């Protein structure tokens, strides 16, 4: 719930139990650091700084580098259906890879599931 519904905090749960509605508020020293949480994102390893590792680099190497560089958690790979096949084609359908091992190569046209912080 707290991952997919934006946020399910005890304070919000108590407020919705009390009111069954939502009301606007005002800026405070608190409820402004409340935005500091990770969100879902997709990263393309084509133009970013990690595109160098996208040729044949290790997925675990990419993961540890992203964490130690930006606290940039990544856990999934979005890969084309016929990317593994040597025959080129116009198919753009992409399947999902869940928790790749450390010794996993990278296709230069791969999309990676990721989580990033807030500024």
């Amino acid at each position: 719930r707290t991952l997919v519904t934006g946020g399910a905090t005890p304070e919000l749960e108590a407020l919705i139990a009390e009111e069954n509605a939502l009301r606007g508020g005002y800026s405070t020293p608190q409820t402004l650091a409340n935005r500091d949480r990770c969100r879902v994102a997709q990263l393309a390893l084509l133009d970013g700084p990690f595109a160098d590792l996208g040729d044949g680099g290790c997925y675990g190497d990419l993961f540890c580098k992203a964490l130690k560089t930006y606290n940039m958690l990544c856990f999934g790979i979005y890969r084309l259906r016929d990317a593994h096949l040597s025959t080129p084609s116009q198919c753009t359908k992409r399947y999902v890879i869940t928790n790749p091992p450390y010794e996993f190569e990278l296709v230069p046209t791969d999309l990676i599931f990721c989580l990033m912080q807030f500024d």
Binding site: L22, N34, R37, V96, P100, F113
Partner: protein, 401 residues
């Protein structure tokens, strides 16, 4: 120990629940399962019960009868499970029935764990207002509409996340495929599941990214969250992990999960500050036309298609818009949302959406290629197709045509 399963006892749901709960790859299956229903089972269902002879026992009775509840020995049961008809014509009647089941169970025994489905989100407050209910203790209820709409909304921002999350709960083994296709890679991906277990005490002063990379490079486990009264999704470089924080694990089986413990060495936002909030807006301020959509340049947006009318039920599009208006996003990074469908139906739900910004409505039908070209469906980030009347239509087959 034994558990009690009651509610919409239908054979396909029972088969799915048994094949998921009693899967061979679990640790222990010593717990027993007891059923309750007011209708006698059919011959193939006695065949299934005979197949699972020493794990499940059936009984005849009503969950609203205290004599039946004492007969099933609920006071000795570890937890109670409630199944609801996901394909009921009237969602409100099923929700009220499930609420009555919960009330009866809590009345017979105050302290016991109950898990149930929830067709509509607006009755969650009704269920929570029960005096004996305490979700802090472990009384948890799942809302089907909330989870589905959240999955779709998060898939809008990042495609594939819906199945990424949905494949983390189906308890499955690993099956090898040697055909060198996408199937083997997808199956190796889906072989993983979700587990929770307390980490070793050696990780106290370490930072969260440091312990993440350490556990990854050491024993091939990765973190997604930790328990703090709150669950923090990937804290970064400023949180020192406490003792017994119950980190969340992703692995193929609980055996590698156990390895971690045995370690060898103006009003812009909501009053809560959780989501963006704006002043109430009249629907006429967000009604658009074909020419208005043509002159309105839209790119990198979200288009949702809704089919229904006044006679149709309610989906709860507020519960879909809500995760897309979180405070985690900046204001100018928000995704514009437009609506295509019946205005007569959509006025029944607009009153739950006037507090959100960047919302547009285009009356018509989503089968109009002119309308789809007007909303610039070429440049949309994600297109969503729903159907309010998917359940109440007469034909058993030919659904969502």
């Amino acid at each position: 120990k034994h558990i009690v399963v009651c509610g919409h006892i239908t054979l396909e749901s029972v088969s799915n629940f048994l094949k998921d709960f009693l899967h061979k790859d679990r640790d222990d299956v010593n717990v027993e399962i007891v059923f309750l229903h007011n209708i006698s089972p059919n011959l193939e269902l006695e065949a299934l019960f005979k197949r699972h002879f020493t794990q499940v026992e059936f009984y005849q009775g009503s969950v609203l009868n205290p004599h039946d509840l004492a007969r099933v020995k609920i006071e000795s049961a570890d937890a109670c499970l409630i199944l609801a008809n996901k394909y009921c014509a009237d969602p409100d009647a099923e929700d009220a029935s499930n609420i009555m089941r919960v009330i009866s169970i809590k009345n017979y025994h105050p302290k016991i764990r109950i898990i149930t489905q929830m067709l509509q989100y607006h009755n969650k407050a009704h269920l929570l207002n029960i005096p004996s209910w305490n979700w802090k203790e472990g009384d948890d209820a799942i809302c089907l509409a909330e989870l589905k709409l959240g999955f779709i909304a998060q898939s809008c921002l990042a495609q594939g996340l819906s199945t990424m999350l949905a494949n983390l709960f189906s308890m499955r083994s690993f099956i090898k495929i040697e055909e060198d296709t996408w199937q083997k890679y997808y199956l190796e991906g889906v072989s993983n599941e979700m587990y929770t277990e307390y980490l070793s005490s050696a990780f106290v002063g370490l930072s969260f990214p440091t312990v993440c990379e350490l556990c990854f490079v050491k024993l091939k486990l990765l973190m997604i969250a930790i328990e703090y009264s709150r669950i923090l999704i990937n804290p970064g470089n400023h949180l020192k992990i406490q003792e017994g924080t119950l980190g969340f694990f992703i692995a193929s089986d609980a055996k590698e999960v156990k390895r971690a413990f045995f370690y060898c060495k103006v009003k812009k936002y909501d009053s809560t500050g959780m989501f963006h909030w704006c002043a109430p807006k009249e629907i006429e301020k967000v009604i658009l036309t074909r020419s208005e959509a043509a002159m309105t340049v839209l790119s990198g947006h979200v288009v949702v298609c809704i089919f229904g009318d006044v006679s149709s039920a309610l989906i709860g599009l507020r519960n879909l818009v809500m995760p897309l208006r979180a405070s985690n996003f900046h204001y100018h990074e928000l995704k514009h949302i437009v609506f295509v469908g019946s205005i007569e139906y959509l006025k029944r739900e607009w009153e739950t959406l006037h507090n959100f910004p960047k919302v547009s409505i285009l009356p018509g039908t989503p089968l109009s290629r002119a309308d789809l070209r007007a909303v610039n469906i070429n440049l949309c980030d994600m297109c969503v197709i729903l159907s309010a009347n998917q359940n109440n239509i007469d034909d058993t087959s030919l659904q969502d045509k």
